[PDB]
């Protein structure tokens, strides 16, 4: 299914995912499309982070639902 990841810079990243998927793998296919390391990024939904071990349907992220990517601090 299709979900969106609104980011900095007004960018919109479009990913094909399954509710079965880890949040880690959502980070992993953001990496292939954007070249962003998965452990320097953190996704928020309903304005809350989602730990990598859990899945998107546990947070009832249905299709066409919008996420936002805050990137972990540099150092960090």
């Amino acid at each position: 299914m299709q979900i969106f990841v609104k980011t900095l810079t007004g960018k919109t990243i479009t990913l094909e995912v399954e509710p079965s998927d880890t949040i880690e793998n959502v980070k992993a296919k953001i990496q292939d499309k954007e070249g962003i390391p998965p452990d320097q990024q953190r996704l928020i939904f309903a304005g809350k982070q989602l730990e990598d071990g859990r899945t998107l349907s546990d947070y009832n992220i249905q299709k066409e639902s919008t996420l936002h990517l805050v990137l972990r601090l540099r150092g960090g």
Binding site: P37, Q40, L73, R74, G75
Partner: protein, 201 residues
């Protein structure tokens, strides 16, 4: 006593620093704690045109035995007021010391990057949140506060006594001048809330 691709790298990187132009100009320096080379004491001079100018900062360098494929763990022994360094523990927030470490980096380039970090702090990405927001919200107050820490801790020329008078006034109440310099600086040199913070229990 190590896997030696560390012993050989450390020994030549150590010998590389003492032969450098930065050590000849007294910018960086490294020394031996023990003689297995897993712990080194580094020293960097405060960059010019920065509040740390005239100061010399001791650095604790511990070489992991996964060297050179993992970075050395560096910690500031000398206290410093910097948004990317702990004002309490000396922990360093630099990407070359974490994810962005490369095996090609040497002792010299780590010391030069840390010396560069003093010249160009990243307040949006901080190690010490208190130092960082003072850095953003009050640029001039941070500069002299870092200047004061630069002398009290790194032997620089004194910051001008508009700040020591408070350090004098709170000590007139019998308070620890080490606790006062920490309390006054974290509370942005407001003696009232510093005096209220001053008391642990």
């Amino acid at each position: 006593s190590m896997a030696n691709i560390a012993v050989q790298r450390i020994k030549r990187e150590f010998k590389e620093v003492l032969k450098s132009e930065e050590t000849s100009k007294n910018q960086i320096k490294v020394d031996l704690v023990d003689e297995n080379f897993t712990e080194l004491r580094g020293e960097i001079a405060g960059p010019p045109d920065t509040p740390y100018e005239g100061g010399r900062y001791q650095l604790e360098i511990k070489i992991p035995e996964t060297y050179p494929f993992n970075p050395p763990k560096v910690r500031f022994i000398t206290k410093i007021w910097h948004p990317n360094i702990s004002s309490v523990t000396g922990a360093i927030k630099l990407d070359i010391l974490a994810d962005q470490w490369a095996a090609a980096m040497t002792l010299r380039t780590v010391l030069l990057s840390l010396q560069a970090l003093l010249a160009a702090a990243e307040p949006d990405d901080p190690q010490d949140a208190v130092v960082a927001n003072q850095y953003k919200q009050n640029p001039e107050m941070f500069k002299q506060t870092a200047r004061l820490w630069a002398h009290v801790y790194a032997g620089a020329p004194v910051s001008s006594p508009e700040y020591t008078k408070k350090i004098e006034n709170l000590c007139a109440m019998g308070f620890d001048r080490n606790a006062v310099i920490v309390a006054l600086s974290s509370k942005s040199w407001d003696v009232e809330t510093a005096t209220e913070l001053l008391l642990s229990n």
